[PDB]
Amino acid sequence: RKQISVRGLAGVENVTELKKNFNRHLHFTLVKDRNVATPRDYYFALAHTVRDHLVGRWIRTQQHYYEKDPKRIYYLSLEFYMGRTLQNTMVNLALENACDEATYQLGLDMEELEEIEEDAGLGNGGLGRLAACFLDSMATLGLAAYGYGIRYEFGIFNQKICGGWQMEEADDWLRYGNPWEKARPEFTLPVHFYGRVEHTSQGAKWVDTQVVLAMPYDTPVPGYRNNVVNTMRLWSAKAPNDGYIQAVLDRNLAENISRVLYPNDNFFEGKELRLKQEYFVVAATLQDIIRRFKSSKNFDAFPDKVAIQLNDTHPSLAIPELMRVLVDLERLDWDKAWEVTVKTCAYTNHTVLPEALERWPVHLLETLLPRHLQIIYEINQRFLNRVAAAFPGDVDRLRRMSLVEEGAVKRINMAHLCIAGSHAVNGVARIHSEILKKTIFKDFYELEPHKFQNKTNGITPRRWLVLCNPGLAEIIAERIGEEYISDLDQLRKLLSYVDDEAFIRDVAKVKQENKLKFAAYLEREYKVHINPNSLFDVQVKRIHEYKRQLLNCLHVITLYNRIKKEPNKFVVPRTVMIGGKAAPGYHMAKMIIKLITAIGDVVNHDPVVGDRLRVIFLENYRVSLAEKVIPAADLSEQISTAGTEASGTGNMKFMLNGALTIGTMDGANVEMAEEAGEENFFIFGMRVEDVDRLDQRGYNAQEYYDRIPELRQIIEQLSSGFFSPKQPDLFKDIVNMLMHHDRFKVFADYEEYVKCQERVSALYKNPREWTRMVIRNIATSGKFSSDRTIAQYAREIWGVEPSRQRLP
Amino acid sequence: RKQISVRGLAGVENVTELKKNFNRHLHFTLVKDRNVATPRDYYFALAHTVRDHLVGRWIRTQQHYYEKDPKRIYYLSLEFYMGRTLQNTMVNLALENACDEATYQLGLDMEELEEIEEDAGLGNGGLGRLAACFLDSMATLGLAAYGYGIRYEFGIFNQKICGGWQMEEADDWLRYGNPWEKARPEFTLPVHFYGRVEHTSQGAKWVDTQVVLAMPYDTPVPGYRNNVVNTMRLWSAKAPNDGYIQAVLDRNLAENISRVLYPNDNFFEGKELRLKQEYFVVAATLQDIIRRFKSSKNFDAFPDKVAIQLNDTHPSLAIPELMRVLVDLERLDWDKAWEVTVKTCAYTNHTVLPEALERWPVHLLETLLPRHLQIIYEINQRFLNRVAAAFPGDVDRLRRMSLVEEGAVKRINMAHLCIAGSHAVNGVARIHSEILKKTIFKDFYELEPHKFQNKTNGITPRRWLVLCNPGLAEIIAERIGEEYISDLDQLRKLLSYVDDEAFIRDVAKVKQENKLKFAAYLEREYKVHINPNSLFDVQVKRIHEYKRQLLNCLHVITLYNRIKKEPNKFVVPRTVMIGGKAAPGYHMAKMIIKLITAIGDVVNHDPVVGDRLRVIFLENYRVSLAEKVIPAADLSEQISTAGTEASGTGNMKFMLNGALTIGTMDGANVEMAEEAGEENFFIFGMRVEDVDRLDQRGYNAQEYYDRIPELRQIIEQLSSGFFSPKQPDLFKDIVNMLMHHDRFKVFADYEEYVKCQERVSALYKNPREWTRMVIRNIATSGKFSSDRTIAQYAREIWGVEPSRQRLP
Numbered sequence A, B: 001r002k003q004i005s006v007r008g009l010a011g012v013e014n015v016t017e018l019k020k021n022f023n024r025h026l027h028f029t030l031v032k033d034r035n036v037a038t039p040r041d042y043y044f045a046l047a048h049t050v051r052d053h054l055v056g057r058w059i060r061t062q063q064h065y066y067e068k069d070p071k072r073i074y075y076l077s078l079e080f081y082m083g084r085t086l087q088n089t090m091v092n093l094a095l096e097n098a099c100d101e102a103t104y105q106l107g108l109d110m111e112e113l114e115e116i117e118e119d120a121g122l123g124n125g126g127l128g129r130l131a132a133c134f135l136d137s138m139a140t141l142g143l144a145a146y147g148y149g150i151r152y153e154f155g156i157f158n159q160k161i162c163g164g165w166q167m168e169e170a171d172d173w174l175r176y177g178n179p180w181e182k183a184r185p186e187f188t189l190p191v192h193f194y195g196r197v198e199h200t201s202q203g204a205k206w207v208d209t210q211v212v213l214a215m216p217y218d219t220p221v222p223g224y225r226n227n228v229v230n231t232m233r234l235w236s237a238k239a240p241n242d243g244y245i246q247a248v249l250d251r252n253l254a255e256n257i258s259r260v261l262y263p264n265d266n267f268f269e270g271k272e273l274r275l276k277q278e279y280f281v282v283a284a285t286l287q288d289i290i291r292r293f294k295s296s297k298n299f300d301a302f303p304d305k306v307a308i309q310l311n312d313t314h315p316s317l318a319i320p321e322l323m324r325v326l327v328d329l330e331r332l333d334w335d336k337a338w339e340v341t342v343k344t345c346a347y348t349n350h351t352v353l354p355e356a357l358e359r360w361p362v363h364l365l366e367t368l369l370p371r372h373l374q375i376i377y378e379i380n381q382r383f384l385n386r387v388a389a390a391f392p393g394d395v396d397r398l399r400r401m402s403l404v405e406e407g408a409v410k411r412i413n414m415a416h417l418c419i420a421g422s423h424a425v426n427g428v429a430r431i432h433s434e435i436l437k438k439t440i441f442k443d444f445y446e447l448e449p450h451k452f453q454n455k456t457n458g459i460t461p462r463r464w465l466v467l468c469n470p471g472l473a474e475i476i477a478e479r480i481g482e483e484y485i486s487d488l489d490q491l492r493k494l495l496s497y498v499d500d501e502a503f504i505r506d507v508a509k510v511k512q513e514n515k516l517k518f519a520a521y522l523e524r525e526y527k528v529h530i531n532p533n534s535l536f537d538v539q540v541k542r543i544h545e546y547k548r549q550l551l552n553c554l555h556v557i558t559l560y561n562r563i564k565k566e567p568n569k570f571v572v573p574r575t576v577m578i579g580g581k582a583a584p585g586y587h588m589a590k591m592i593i594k595l596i597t598a599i600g601d602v603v604n605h606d607p608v609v610g611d612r613l614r615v616i617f618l619e620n621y622r623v624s625l626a627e628k629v630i631p632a633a634d635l636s637e638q639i640s641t642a643g644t645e646a647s648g649t650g651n652m653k654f655m656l657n658g659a660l661t662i663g664t665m666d667g668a669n670v671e672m673a674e675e676a677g678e679e680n681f682f683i684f685g686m687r688v689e690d691v692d693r694l695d696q697r698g699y700n701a702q703e704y705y706d707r708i709p710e711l712r713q714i715i716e717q718l719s720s721g722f723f724s725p726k727q728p729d730l731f732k733d734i735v736n737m738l739m740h741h742d743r744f745k746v747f748a749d750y751e752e753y754v755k756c757q758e759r760v761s762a763l764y765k766n767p768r769e770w771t772r773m774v775i776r777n778i779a780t781s782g783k784f785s786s787d788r789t790i791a792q793y794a795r796e797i798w799g800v801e802p803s804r805q806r807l808p
């Protein structure tokens, strides 16, 4: 535990100091005595103690950026899926062993204390977690980078499983306070809504608006042992200063803007409140950007001093807002303001699913943001004039490329707005960025090919290796030193150890340790027992049809049915774990969760099966749980329909943590297999080309049903009520979608998936060879560090050079 | 400044320590550098530094009460009008001179920093401020006393004067945080609403309720230099743990319970939200009381270990709630539970005005608190049985004494509930307590004479002398030492100085210093100029008809009209200041404010008048402003209709601070005059007896109009639009009320008031004799220390002996 060298030194004076400050905070901050103090009090005493170590560096870092005046990177996102902060802070400041020793001497278990901290669950999934990894990597790469978002009072809902169904409860993450953030009410800014436009003597004026205040809360973002501490600024909605009682209560309405994260993953819902949130972040953020620009030494130098990165189209209003500020308030001519805006802004796309893309009704924008709609129209007219000049007489292209979508309800295509108003547009994996240029944004790619880039996603090896899997980090460091922690390509050195008996032993030893620990977590927290001598088969990710948890379900039932047909036949024991949240209004996703639990109700209680197969639904999947389960996983399920998962990042986490991957050639799965060698991945199923071929002739699920007796058996089990005897018709909607309305072709990959899974079991029967393939995976996961990703953003889009150079 | 000895020592190590901790907090707490730090940052750095000095004593005091196990005093109030905390803390801990020196050395003016702090304005007026003085005195008297209330997000509205009218804005006192309180989310308790009653096997059960959580916030309450730090616990409403988005937003509804203070002074409005607030405090508080009782060493010893003081009928639900807990949850028989309840509870009455008394509709109580209504009915039946036994056949007495008020809407009389359920009932001045026994509660007094007590109000000489008027505190200490600060009767020693030339000089010198300072405040904050060589004539208190700001208006116009009639005639120059808030729905009070400003619009701009007379409306009258204006006052206006002001406390503040009093024989005015000698007070107008005589024959305002030419002139000025030329009929409602519907007989005291005011001017023309009478006032203000009041509560009601003995 304390013997782990990647965890740093327990200096005698440092341990002394930590204990003193722990005790100081318990007394003065918590107002507690050792007689009444709870484990929670002790967590907070430690949190404040550790947080104190960020402050000096935090002040100096921001002073450094003022003095050096580097180009500043503003990462705008509606989501920051941060997770917990205590361990991350200790890791990045080299304090983990010292705090572990200090708390031990005080008679406390630091890991028990760590479990007390609430996740900052201010994200839905991959997009939100990407923002979080990016913040970490940008600090580690010494960039003057500023995360900007919303401080949701309630993050992603806490998931309860009750009667086998998902129940949602408010994620009250701030109940006991947040010891990391610093409230900055003095830097509160006004954000305007509604009102109307007056075009007058100077030009346009936005008047008669309703004001909502944006109160910033700043959170330190430590780089890895480089003395850099950057800032995440999250805005909180506040009623403006100035019958009676009802008027005071009605302050809640404005303040609702920052109340709760919209729980949609890869799905657009056009709620006005969501639009208000989106503008809230954009307006307040751009005020900071402009003010800071002005206090740095005329708007010709703006894109040399400012980069605005748009995480999806969610902060896309930054484009017309910047135009609004520059033209209406700063009084620049349109053309120069637009030159500045495009050079300043860049856009990252995260999906190709049409229903996941933002298309706001013009009426909503006209009412809420009349000046912005006017600016959008003008952007559109001039952009389409450029299209018309480049492609004379191509009228359909004009229609296709327009920011304005015609129809029953006229809408603004926010992605189109982003491409027009950005100098760079990127997808998040090679295949995805290619598909953007080929299909979705083909016309835009043809107009401006230089604009379109790829930035394959990454994950931080701090949180996602050193923090969550110190045992693996240690055995790696024992061989290759510690440099890999911020230079992950050095993991390639581990290929020299594929035949090393000691390393093979240790890789397997670490995995087993993680599996025992996760089993212990489930027993402690849920009284759920899992077979420690079973393959841990894990699919953790948001519940979506495209991600095909349903395909996993079909395979699980296949294993069950095969056991029942031939009970004497040996099979590799498995614990099949599926976890993830369904969006509250996503009926099918909610049914899918109930199916998983219902499958378990049969399988986990069939005495013929016993511990040979178990299916469990991991409740409340979130960042902190990912940190627990991923290091314990043997098999990583990455089985999206080819062409649907833009990148994935959970895949990267599994690869880095010693699981083998079963997956389709989709998103970053392709590059992962490329890095490791396809021989080291369990690749199966339709390629994008094959999916398109099925689309061309029409997908007929009935054909697969008719030709595959084992599939037929399962569908009939589902329909007849084998998995819901008390309500036979419970899964009729799932069965109907699969048979008649499956956009994601579950049946088409069933046979290949089942066969590929057989090969997984075949390799698992050979522990030595399983582990050797694992080594080949970990050793080639280096590309998927978010440091690599960020360095690319920095050099190819932002025009800044990253540096891992330590601050004094 | 720093030469003031009552402000303590500036120890060299102490000054060093304070500066170090100031700097430590600026760095680690505020995350600020001297380059970006504002005066507000510096205030907070000081506040945290000073607050740290409370902690050791706070922990030790509460440990002391656990060890000693004294009887605990629970002071239940819907209001705690605390004001600011920084200076009070420094005063009570003897740190003022040290902090003044420390900040000076840091290049800061501590008094500028003090002005940054928001008032904890969690009260309306006298009743709320009494609770605050009581907390201070109970700590100074070493009582194990616990203030319990609601942490309003918004206290008493901030008053703006715009176009001469009151405008209300939300009092966002927590905008920049509160460095004094300690949030205690770990001690959160459930409070129940609505639901229904099941009478079953064990008995009654309150079921199907809606839960609102009560989160306690604890604030230190330091005694005067005795090392005692008690606790004020204020509950905050929190939604319970467990479509989607709307459900999360609807958490606001439960949380609205603690959102805002109902801005009514001496007026009952029967809003359900107010009832919810009242029960919210009671339910959460009594849970603490019961739990603490159980952890002290069977409910026979409860009243020996618990006292519950009810500040007005606002927490009266404590009576049926205690019964509910003891009978329904603790399973005691009714009779024993009732014995306990009465012995535990005591009730303080603050008014005789019928519209100020709480009478809740039975339907509201039945819906919101069905079990409580049931218990109230049973309390009533048994109480009336006792009445019937004591007064056989007296049926009207039964009707009069019933807790249930019959009529169109059937109501519960909360005062009747309180008397029935309390072993002690007290009024707040001798005349008031007598009037209670004579009229309002006559029947109850006849049934249980022993129950009825007097506790004449008091004010704390810490906040109200040492803090607000250090100059006066010092010249007093120079003669008689410092013991008087917690033994105010020692001020009687000052009678030996009525002929002392040095003291006469210094008393006058201090007053002038305060007047210059207040003039400077008005110039700095409002660019309002006042004549420093004018008598400061001050009426500060909530705007009410009974308090008769209108009588003040009539006199002001009389002075104006007399000047205009005889411009050559010398008059003592006056600055007439009136300040105070009107309840938002109190139309007449709002008109009265507009009249004051409208009078000023004429008087302050008449060139014949010049600086001989000025009328100003003091905006946003609150605790911190009282601390500024009261020490600057020459004349204290205490002119309520005899029999209407229960006590007053503002009167006491003025007496202690060297103003002479013009007042009616009402409330504590009577005892003030008794203490000082009537010759030293400007007493005028109807006595209670005279008011009653007018009521018997009918008050005819027309008679006074017909007989007093000067009054007639003023009424005609008001009616014709002399004070509102742009809207002649503006004051028709005021004129109509005065002439036809005046419950408070303004005209009946006009002549005596004007004559008495002439005598004020006559004495003011003689500075020596003015000051000598002032000395006779300050010297006899000792009775009106809240220490005296609290000692009486302790000995006569709570059954505890006060002690000024220092903790180690």
Ligand SMILES: OC[C@H]1O[C@H](O)[C@H](O)[C@@H](O)[C@@H]1O
Pocket (backbone or CB within 6 Å): A125, A126, A127, A128, A130, A266, A350, A351, A428, A457, A645, A646, A647, A648, A649, A667
């Ligand atoms: O780009 C970050 C992530 O965004 C979204 O969650 C996509 O669905 C996922 O494929 C991608 O990895």
Ligand SMILES: OC[C@H]1O[C@H](O)[C@H](O)[C@@H](O)[C@@H]1O
Pocket (backbone or CB within 6 Å): B125, B126, B127, B128, B130, B266, B350, B351, B428, B457, B645, B646, B647, B648, B649, B667
């Ligand atoms: O008892 C405290 C105070 O309560 C109310 O404000 C009364 O109106 C006042 O007369 C009294 O002094």
